[PDB]
Amino acid sequence: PQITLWKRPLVTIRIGGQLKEALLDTGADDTVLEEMNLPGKWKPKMIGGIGGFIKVRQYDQIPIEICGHKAIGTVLVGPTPVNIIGRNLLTQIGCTLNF
Amino acid sequence: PQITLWKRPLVTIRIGGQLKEALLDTGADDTVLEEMNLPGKWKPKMIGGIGGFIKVRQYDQIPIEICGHKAIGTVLVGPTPVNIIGRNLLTQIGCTLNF
Ligand SMILES: CCCCCN(C[C@@H](O)[C@H](Cc1ccccc1)NC(=O)[C@@H](NC(C)=O)C(C)C)S(=O)(=O)c1ccc2ncsc2c1
């Protein structure tokens, strides 16, 4: 698809068999989802943005289907204000900015 | 142009005829610039990010050029670690996400 930006670029994702809404975020290095259960071992990590740093759980090699496009990559889980799809997965789905 | 997302989508912007590097950020509602001493009236505002809120100064109707594309709108100024071009300006330059 081509997505304009008059509204937040929210899309439906499927992860660990569950549907969620997530923001396509070119300003995010990493993909960060709200607290949830994922299978496998996680590593404690910290990430930062505006407002400072939070503690997250890093899950590696996690399949996510984003708007019908498959990705398998690193997914951080923690107290993010919104589900964020970052550049690590946006590149996997062939997403670019155009103007 | 087309901008891939292998690295942060940083571009040159002009504000006050002065050049700066800024992130093209689809996850940002508003435009947030690092501390700078812009002339004119402003309003205090709080904006929320991954780790909490920061205090910003809201300036209205500020001309900005983004990659040689003219825009004019609201710019928030405050202690952000990176200059952020948000959707309020991205729409004005015809920027889309595409995959
Ligand atoms: C929480 C709501 C959704 C994300 C919003 N952020 C934009 C986001 O792209 C920032 C943009 C950003 C802010 C600060 C440093 C680096 C990028 N990225 C990050 O926080 C990421 N951090 C990094 C390092 O990529 C995380 C998600 C991994 S934001 O920067 O917090 C933001 C920007 C503009 C704006 N206007 C009104 S509220 C508001 C909030």
Coordinates of N, CA and C and ligand atoms in Angstrom, one line a residue:
Chain A
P1 N 0.8 -1.2 0.0 CA 0.0 0.0 0.0 C 0.8 1.3 0.0
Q2 N 0.2 2.4 -0.4 CA 0.7 3.7 -0.2 C -0.1 4.3 1.0
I3 N 0.6 4.8 2.0 CA -0.1 5.3 3.2 C 0.3 6.8 3.4
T4 N -0.8 7.6 3.4 CA -0.6 9.1 3.7 C -0.5 9.3 5.2
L5 N -0.3 10.5 5.6 CA 0.1 10.8 7.0 C -0.8 11.8 7.7
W6 N -2.0 12.0 7.1 CA -3.0 12.9 7.7 C -3.5 12.3 9.0
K7 N -3.4 11.0 9.1 CA -3.7 10.2 10.3 C -2.5 9.4 10.7
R8 N -2.5 9.0 12.0 CA -1.4 8.1 12.4 C -1.4 6.8 11.6
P9 N -0.2 6.4 11.1 CA -0.1 5.2 10.3 C -0.2 3.9 11.1
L10 N -1.4 3.6 11.6 CA -1.7 2.5 12.4 C -2.1 1.3 11.5
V11 N -1.6 0.1 11.7 CA -2.0 -1.0 10.9 C -2.2 -2.2 11.8
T12 N -2.9 -3.2 11.4 CA -3.1 -4.4 12.1 C -1.9 -5.3 11.9
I13 N -1.4 -5.9 13.0 CA -0.4 -6.9 13.0 C -0.9 -8.2 13.6
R14 N -0.3 -9.3 13.2 CA -0.5 -10.6 13.9 C 0.9 -11.1 14.5
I15 N 0.8 -11.4 15.8 CA 2.0 -11.8 16.5 C 1.7 -12.9 17.6
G16 N 2.4 -14.0 17.6 CA 2.1 -15.1 18.5 C 0.6 -15.5 18.5
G17 N 0.0 -15.4 17.3 CA -1.4 -15.7 17.0 C -2.4 -14.7 17.4
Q18 N -2.0 -13.5 17.9 CA -3.0 -12.5 18.3 C -2.9 -11.3 17.4
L19 N -4.1 -10.6 17.2 CA -4.1 -9.4 16.5 C -4.0 -8.1 17.3
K20 N -3.2 -7.2 16.9 CA -2.9 -5.9 17.5 C -2.8 -4.8 16.5
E21 N -3.0 -3.5 17.0 CA -2.8 -2.3 16.2 C -1.4 -1.8 16.5
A22 N -0.7 -1.4 15.5 CA 0.7 -0.9 15.7 C 1.0 0.3 14.8
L23 N 1.9 1.2 15.3 CA 2.2 2.4 14.5 C 3.5 2.1 13.7
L24 N 3.4 2.4 12.4 CA 4.6 2.4 11.5 C 5.4 3.6 11.7
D25 N 6.6 3.5 12.3 CA 7.3 4.5 12.9 C 8.7 4.6 12.4
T26 N 8.9 5.4 11.4 CA 10.2 5.6 10.8 C 11.3 6.2 11.7
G27 N 10.8 6.9 12.8 CA 11.6 7.5 13.8 C 12.1 6.5 14.9
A28 N 11.7 5.2 14.8 CA 12.0 4.2 15.8 C 13.0 3.2 15.2
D29 N 14.2 3.1 15.9 CA 15.2 2.1 15.5 C 14.7 0.7 15.7
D30 N 14.0 0.5 16.8 CA 13.5 -0.8 17.3 C 12.0 -0.9 17.2
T31 N 11.5 -2.1 17.3 CA 10.1 -2.4 17.4 C 9.8 -2.7 18.8
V32 N 8.8 -2.0 19.4 CA 8.5 -2.1 20.8 C 7.0 -2.2 21.0
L33 N 6.6 -3.3 21.6 CA 5.1 -3.6 21.9 C 4.8 -3.4 23.4
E34 N 3.5 -3.1 23.6 CA 3.0 -3.0 25.0 C 3.1 -4.4 25.7
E35 N 3.1 -4.4 27.0 CA 3.4 -5.6 27.8 C 2.5 -6.7 27.3
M36 N 3.1 -7.9 27.1 CA 2.4 -9.1 26.6 C 3.2 -10.3 26.8
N37 N 2.7 -11.5 26.6 CA 3.4 -12.7 26.7 C 3.9 -13.1 25.3
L38 N 5.2 -13.4 25.2 CA 5.8 -14.1 24.0 C 6.5 -15.3 24.5
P39 N 6.5 -16.4 23.6 CA 7.3 -17.5 24.0 C 8.8 -17.3 23.8
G40 N 9.6 -18.1 24.5 CA 11.1 -18.0 24.4 C 11.7 -17.2 25.5
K41 N 13.1 -17.2 25.5 CA 13.9 -16.5 26.5 C 14.0 -15.0 26.0
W42 N 13.9 -14.1 27.0 CA 14.1 -12.7 26.7 C 15.3 -12.2 27.4
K43 N 15.9 -11.1 27.0 CA 17.0 -10.5 27.6 C 16.5 -9.1 28.1
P44 N 16.8 -8.7 29.4 CA 16.5 -7.4 29.8 C 17.3 -6.4 29.0
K45 N 16.7 -5.3 28.6 CA 17.3 -4.2 27.8 C 16.7 -2.9 28.2
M46 N 17.4 -1.8 27.9 CA 16.8 -0.5 28.1 C 16.8 0.3 26.8
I47 N 15.8 1.0 26.5 CA 15.7 1.9 25.4 C 15.2 3.3 25.8
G48 N 15.6 4.2 24.9 CA 15.3 5.6 25.2 C 14.6 6.4 24.1
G49 N 13.9 7.4 24.4 CA 13.3 8.3 23.5 C 13.1 9.7 24.1
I50 N 12.0 10.4 23.7 CA 11.7 11.6 24.3 C 11.1 11.2 25.7
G51 N 11.5 11.9 26.8 CA 11.0 11.6 28.1 C 11.9 10.7 28.9
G52 N 12.8 10.0 28.2 CA 13.9 9.2 28.9 C 13.9 7.8 28.5
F53 N 14.3 6.9 29.5 CA 14.5 5.5 29.2 C 13.5 4.6 29.9
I54 N 13.2 3.5 29.3 CA 12.4 2.5 29.9 C 13.1 1.1 29.9
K55 N 12.7 0.2 30.7 CA 13.1 -1.2 30.7 C 12.2 -2.0 29.9
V56 N 12.8 -2.8 29.0 CA 12.1 -3.7 28.1 C 12.6 -5.1 28.2
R57 N 11.9 -6.1 27.6 CA 12.3 -7.5 27.4 C 12.6 -7.7 25.9
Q58 N 13.8 -8.1 25.6 CA 14.1 -8.3 24.2 C 13.9 -9.8 23.8
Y59 N 13.0 -10.0 22.8 CA 12.8 -11.3 22.2 C 13.4 -11.3 20.8
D60 N 14.1 -12.3 20.5 CA 14.8 -12.4 19.2 C 14.0 -13.3 18.2
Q61 N 14.1 -13.0 16.9 CA 13.7 -13.9 15.9 C 12.2 -14.3 16.0
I62 N 11.4 -13.3 16.2 CA 9.9 -13.4 16.4 C 9.2 -13.1 15.1
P63 N 8.4 -14.0 14.6 CA 7.5 -13.7 13.4 C 6.4 -12.7 13.7
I64 N 6.3 -11.7 12.9 CA 5.2 -10.8 12.9 C 4.7 -10.6 11.5
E65 N 3.4 -10.6 11.3 CA 2.8 -10.3 10.0 C 2.2 -8.9 10.1
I66 N 2.7 -8.0 9.2 CA 2.4 -6.6 9.3 C 1.6 -6.2 8.0
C67 N 0.3 -6.0 8.2 CA -0.5 -5.6 7.0 C -0.3 -6.6 5.9
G68 N -0.2 -7.9 6.2 CA -0.1 -9.0 5.3 C 1.3 -9.3 4.8
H69 N 2.3 -8.6 5.3 CA 3.7 -8.8 5.0 C 4.4 -9.5 6.1
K70 N 5.1 -10.6 5.9 CA 5.8 -11.3 6.9 C 7.1 -10.7 7.3
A71 N 7.4 -10.6 8.6 CA 8.7 -10.3 9.1 C 9.1 -11.3 10.2
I72 N 10.4 -11.4 10.4 CA 10.8 -12.2 11.6 C 12.0 -11.5 12.1
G73 N 11.9 -10.9 13.3 CA 13.0 -10.1 13.9 C 12.9 -9.9 15.3
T74 N 13.7 -8.9 15.8 CA 13.7 -8.6 17.2 C 12.5 -7.7 17.6
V75 N 11.8 -8.2 18.7 CA 10.7 -7.5 19.2 C 10.9 -7.2 20.7
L76 N 10.8 -5.9 21.1 CA 11.0 -5.5 22.4 C 9.6 -5.3 23.1
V77 N 9.4 -5.7 24.3 CA 8.2 -5.7 25.0 C 8.4 -5.0 26.3
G78 N 7.5 -4.0 26.5 CA 7.6 -3.2 27.8 C 6.6 -2.1 27.8
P79 N 6.8 -1.1 28.7 CA 5.8 -0.1 29.0 C 5.8 1.1 28.0
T80 N 5.9 0.7 26.7 CA 5.7 1.7 25.6 C 4.3 2.3 25.6
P81 N 4.1 3.6 25.4 CA 2.8 4.2 25.3 C 1.9 3.6 24.1
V82 N 2.5 3.1 23.1 CA 1.8 2.6 21.9 C 2.7 1.5 21.3
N83 N 2.0 0.5 20.7 CA 2.7 -0.5 19.9 C 3.4 0.2 18.7
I84 N 4.7 -0.1 18.6 CA 5.6 0.6 17.6 C 6.3 -0.4 16.7
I85 N 6.1 -0.2 15.4 CA 6.8 -1.0 14.4 C 8.0 -0.1 13.9
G86 N 9.2 -0.5 14.2 CA 10.4 0.3 14.0 C 11.1 -0.2 12.7
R87 N 12.2 0.5 12.5 CA 13.0 0.3 11.2 C 13.5 -1.1 11.0
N88 N 13.8 -1.9 12.1 CA 14.3 -3.2 12.0 C 13.3 -4.1 11.2
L89 N 12.0 -3.9 11.4 CA 11.0 -4.7 10.6 C 10.4 -4.0 9.4
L90 N 10.4 -2.6 9.5 CA 10.0 -1.9 8.3 C 10.8 -2.2 7.1
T91 N 12.1 -2.4 7.3 CA 13.0 -2.7 6.2 C 12.7 -4.1 5.7
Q92 N 12.3 -5.0 6.6 CA 12.0 -6.4 6.2 C 10.7 -6.5 5.3
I93 N 9.8 -5.6 5.5 CA 8.6 -5.5 4.6 C 8.7 -4.6 3.4
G94 N 9.9 -4.0 3.2 CA 10.2 -3.3 2.0 C 9.6 -1.9 2.1
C95 N 9.4 -1.4 3.3 CA 8.8 0.0 3.5 C 9.8 1.1 3.2
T96 N 9.4 2.1 2.5 CA 10.2 3.3 2.2 C 9.4 4.6 2.4
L97 N 10.1 5.7 2.6 CA 9.5 7.0 2.6 C 9.6 7.6 1.2
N98 N 8.6 8.3 0.8 CA 8.5 8.8 -0.6 C 7.9 10.2 -0.6
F99 N 8.5 11.2 -1.3 CA 7.9 12.5 -1.5 C 8.5 13.1 -2.8
Chain B
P1 N 12.1 12.3 -3.8 CA 13.0 11.2 -3.6 C 12.4 10.0 -2.9
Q2 N 13.1 8.9 -2.8 CA 12.7 7.7 -2.0 C 13.8 7.5 -1.0
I3 N 13.4 7.3 0.3 CA 14.3 7.1 1.4 C 14.1 5.7 2.0
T4 N 15.1 4.8 1.9 CA 15.1 3.5 2.6 C 15.3 3.7 4.1
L5 N 15.1 2.6 4.8 CA 15.1 2.7 6.3 C 16.2 1.9 6.9
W6 N 17.3 1.6 6.2 CA 18.4 0.8 6.7 C 19.1 1.6 7.8
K7 N 19.1 2.9 7.7 CA 19.6 3.8 8.7 C 18.5 4.9 9.0
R8 N 18.8 5.6 10.1 CA 17.8 6.7 10.4 C 17.6 7.6 9.3
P9 N 16.3 7.9 8.9 CA 16.0 8.8 7.8 C 16.2 10.3 8.2
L10 N 17.5 10.7 8.3 CA 17.9 12.0 8.6 C 18.0 12.8 7.3
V11 N 17.5 14.0 7.3 CA 17.6 14.9 6.2 C 17.9 16.4 6.6
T12 N 18.3 17.2 5.7 CA 18.6 18.6 6.0 C 17.3 19.4 5.9
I13 N 17.1 20.2 7.0 CA 15.9 21.1 7.0 C 16.5 22.6 7.2
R14 N 15.7 23.5 6.8 CA 16.0 24.9 7.0 C 14.9 25.6 7.8
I15 N 15.3 26.3 8.9 CA 14.4 27.1 9.7 C 15.2 28.3 10.1
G16 N 14.6 29.5 9.8 CA 15.2 30.8 10.0 C 16.3 31.0 8.9
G17 N 16.2 30.3 7.8 CA 17.3 30.3 6.8 C 18.5 29.5 7.3
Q18 N 18.4 28.8 8.4 CA 19.5 28.1 9.0 C 19.3 26.6 8.8
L19 N 20.3 25.8 8.5 CA 20.2 24.4 8.2 C 20.4 23.5 9.5
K20 N 19.7 22.4 9.5 CA 19.8 21.5 10.6 C 19.5 20.1 10.1
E21 N 19.9 19.1 10.8 CA 19.6 17.7 10.4 C 18.5 17.2 11.3
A22 N 17.5 16.5 10.6 CA 16.3 16.1 11.3 C 15.7 14.8 10.7
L23 N 15.0 14.1 11.6 CA 14.5 12.8 11.4 C 13.1 12.9 10.8
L24 N 12.9 12.2 9.7 CA 11.6 12.1 9.1 C 10.8 11.0 9.8
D25 N 9.8 11.4 10.6 CA 9.3 10.6 11.7 C 7.8 10.4 11.6
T26 N 7.4 9.3 10.9 CA 6.0 9.0 10.8 C 5.3 8.7 12.1
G27 N 6.1 8.3 13.2 CA 5.5 8.1 14.5 C 5.3 9.3 15.3
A28 N 5.6 10.5 14.8 CA 5.5 11.8 15.5 C 4.3 12.6 14.9
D29 N 3.4 12.9 15.9 CA 2.2 13.7 15.5 C 2.7 15.1 15.1
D30 N 3.6 15.6 15.9 CA 4.0 17.0 15.9 C 5.5 17.0 15.5
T31 N 6.0 18.2 15.2 CA 7.4 18.5 14.9 C 8.1 19.1 16.2
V32 N 9.2 18.4 16.5 CA 9.9 18.8 17.8 C 11.4 19.0 17.5
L33 N 11.8 20.3 17.7 CA 13.2 20.6 17.5 C 13.9 20.8 18.7
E34 N 15.2 20.5 18.7 CA 16.1 20.7 19.8 C 16.1 22.2 20.2
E35 N 16.5 22.4 21.4 CA 16.5 23.8 22.0 C 17.2 24.8 21.0
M36 N 16.4 25.8 20.6 CA 17.0 26.9 19.8 C 16.2 28.2 20.2
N37 N 16.8 29.3 20.0 CA 16.3 30.6 20.5 C 15.4 31.3 19.4
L38 N 14.3 30.6 19.0 CA 13.4 31.2 18.0 C 12.8 32.5 18.5
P39 N 12.6 33.5 17.6 CA 11.9 34.7 18.0 C 10.4 34.4 18.0
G40 N 9.6 35.3 18.7 CA 8.2 35.3 18.6 C 7.5 34.7 19.8
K41 N 6.2 34.8 19.9 CA 5.4 34.3 20.9 C 5.3 32.8 20.8
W42 N 4.9 32.2 21.9 CA 4.8 30.7 22.0 C 3.9 30.4 23.2
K43 N 3.5 29.1 23.2 CA 2.7 28.6 24.3 C 3.4 27.4 24.9
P44 N 3.3 27.2 26.3 CA 3.8 26.0 26.9 C 3.0 24.8 26.5
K45 N 3.6 23.6 26.4 CA 2.9 22.4 26.0 C 3.7 21.3 26.6
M46 N 3.1 20.1 26.8 CA 3.7 18.9 27.2 C 3.5 17.8 26.2
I47 N 4.5 17.1 25.8 CA 4.4 16.1 24.8 C 5.0 14.8 25.4
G48 N 4.3 13.7 25.1 CA 4.7 12.4 25.7 C 5.4 11.5 24.7
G49 N 6.4 10.9 25.2 CA 7.2 9.9 24.4 C 7.4 8.6 25.2
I50 N 8.3 7.8 24.6 CA 8.4 6.5 25.2 C 8.6 6.5 26.7
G51 N 9.5 7.4 27.2 CA 9.9 7.4 28.7 C 9.1 8.4 29.6
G52 N 8.2 9.1 29.0 CA 7.4 10.1 29.8 C 7.2 11.4 29.0
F53 N 7.0 12.5 29.7 CA 6.7 13.7 29.0 C 7.9 14.7 29.1
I54 N 8.0 15.6 28.1 CA 8.8 16.8 28.2 C 8.0 18.0 28.0
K55 N 8.6 19.1 28.5 CA 8.0 20.5 28.4 C 8.6 21.1 27.1
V56 N 7.7 21.6 26.3 CA 8.1 22.3 25.0 C 7.5 23.6 24.9
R57 N 8.0 24.4 24.0 CA 7.5 25.7 23.6 C 6.9 25.6 22.2
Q58 N 5.6 25.9 22.1 CA 4.9 25.8 20.8 C 4.9 27.1 20.1
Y59 N 5.6 27.1 18.9 CA 5.6 28.3 18.0 C 4.7 28.0 16.8
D60 N 3.9 28.9 16.4 CA 3.0 28.7 15.2 C 3.5 29.4 14.0
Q61 N 3.0 28.8 12.8 CA 3.2 29.4 11.5 C 4.7 29.7 11.2
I62 N 5.6 28.7 11.5 CA 7.0 28.9 11.3 C 7.3 28.2 9.9
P63 N 7.9 29.0 9.0 CA 8.3 28.4 7.7 C 9.5 27.5 7.9
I64 N 9.4 26.3 7.3 CA 10.5 25.3 7.4 C 10.7 24.7 6.0
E65 N 11.9 24.5 5.5 CA 12.1 23.8 4.3 C 12.7 22.4 4.6
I66 N 12.1 21.3 4.0 CA 12.5 20.0 4.3 C 13.0 19.4 2.9
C67 N 14.3 19.1 2.8 CA 14.8 18.7 1.5 C 14.4 19.5 0.3
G68 N 14.4 20.8 0.5 CA 14.0 21.7 -0.6 C 12.5 21.8 -0.8
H69 N 11.7 21.2 0.1 CA 10.3 21.3 0.0 C 9.8 22.3 1.0
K70 N 9.1 23.3 0.6 CA 8.6 24.3 1.6 C 7.4 23.8 2.3
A71 N 7.4 24.2 3.6 CA 6.3 23.9 4.5 C 6.2 25.1 5.5
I72 N 5.1 25.1 6.2 CA 4.9 26.1 7.2 C 3.9 25.6 8.2
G73 N 4.2 25.7 9.5 CA 3.3 25.2 10.5 C 3.9 25.3 11.9
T74 N 3.3 24.5 12.8 CA 3.7 24.5 14.2 C 5.0 23.7 14.4
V75 N 5.9 24.3 15.2 CA 7.1 23.7 15.6 C 7.2 23.8 17.1
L76 N 7.5 22.6 17.8 CA 7.6 22.5 19.2 C 9.1 22.5 19.5
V77 N 9.6 23.4 20.5 CA 11.0 23.5 20.8 C 11.2 23.1 22.3
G78 N 12.2 22.2 22.4 CA 12.5 21.7 23.8 C 13.6 20.7 23.8
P79 N 13.9 20.1 25.0 CA 15.0 19.3 25.2 C 14.9 17.8 24.6
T80 N 14.6 17.8 23.3 CA 14.7 16.5 22.6 C 16.1 16.2 22.2
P81 N 16.5 15.0 22.2 CA 17.9 14.6 21.7 C 18.1 14.6 20.2
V82 N 17.0 14.7 19.5 CA 17.1 14.7 18.0 C 16.0 15.6 17.5
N83 N 16.3 16.3 16.4 CA 15.2 17.1 15.7 C 14.3 16.1 14.9
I84 N 13.0 16.3 15.1 CA 12.0 15.4 14.7 C 11.0 16.1 13.8
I85 N 10.9 15.7 12.5 CA 9.9 16.2 11.6 C 8.7 15.3 11.7
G86 N 7.6 15.8 12.2 CA 6.3 15.0 12.4 C 5.3 15.1 11.3
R87 N 4.2 14.4 11.5 CA 3.2 14.3 10.4 C 2.6 15.7 10.0
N88 N 2.5 16.6 10.9 CA 2.0 18.0 10.6 C 2.7 18.6 9.4
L89 N 4.0 18.3 9.3 CA 4.8 18.8 8.2 C 5.0 17.8 7.1
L90 N 5.1 16.5 7.4 CA 5.3 15.5 6.4 C 4.2 15.5 5.4
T91 N 2.9 15.7 5.8 CA 1.8 15.8 4.9 C 2.0 17.0 3.9
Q92 N 2.5 18.1 4.4 CA 2.6 19.3 3.6 C 3.6 19.1 2.4
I93 N 4.6 18.2 2.6 CA 5.6 17.9 1.6 C 5.2 16.7 0.7
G94 N 4.0 16.1 0.9 CA 3.5 15.0 0.1 C 4.2 13.7 0.5
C95 N 4.7 13.5 1.7 CA 5.4 12.3 2.1 C 4.5 11.2 2.4
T96 N 4.8 10.0 1.9 CA 4.0 8.8 2.1 C 4.9 7.6 2.6
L97 N 4.3 6.6 3.2 CA 4.9 5.3 3.4 C 4.4 4.4 2.3
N98 N 5.4 3.6 1.8 CA 5.1 2.7 0.7 C 5.7 1.3 0.9
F99 N 4.9 0.3 0.8 CA 5.5 -1.1 0.7 C 4.6 -2.0 0.0
Ligands
LIG1 C1 5.0 7.1 22.1 C2 4.1 7.6 21.0 C3 4.7 7.3 19.6 C4 6.2 7.7 19.3 C5 6.3 9.2 19.4 N1 7.8 9.5 19.3 C6 8.3 9.5 18.0 C7 9.3 8.3 17.8 O1 9.5 8.1 16.4 C8 10.6 8.5 18.6 C9 11.6 9.5 17.9 C10 12.8 9.7 18.7 C11 12.8 10.4 19.9 C12 14.0 10.5 20.6 C13 15.2 9.9 20.2 C14 15.2 9.2 19.0 C15 14.0 9.1 18.3 N2 11.3 7.2 18.7 C16 11.5 6.5 19.8 O2 11.1 6.8 20.9 C17 12.4 5.3 19.6 N3 13.8 5.5 20.0 C18 14.8 5.4 19.1 C19 16.1 5.7 19.7 O3 14.6 5.2 17.9 C20 11.9 4.1 20.3 C21 10.4 3.8 19.9 C22 12.7 2.8 20.0 S1 8.1 10.9 20.1 O4 9.4 11.3 19.7 O5 8.1 10.5 21.5 C23 7.1 12.0 19.8 C24 7.3 12.9 18.7 C25 6.5 13.9 18.3 C26 5.3 14.1 19.1 N4 4.3 15.0 18.9 C27 3.4 15.0 19.8 S2 3.6 13.7 21.0 C28 5.0 13.3 20.2 C29 5.9 12.3 20.5

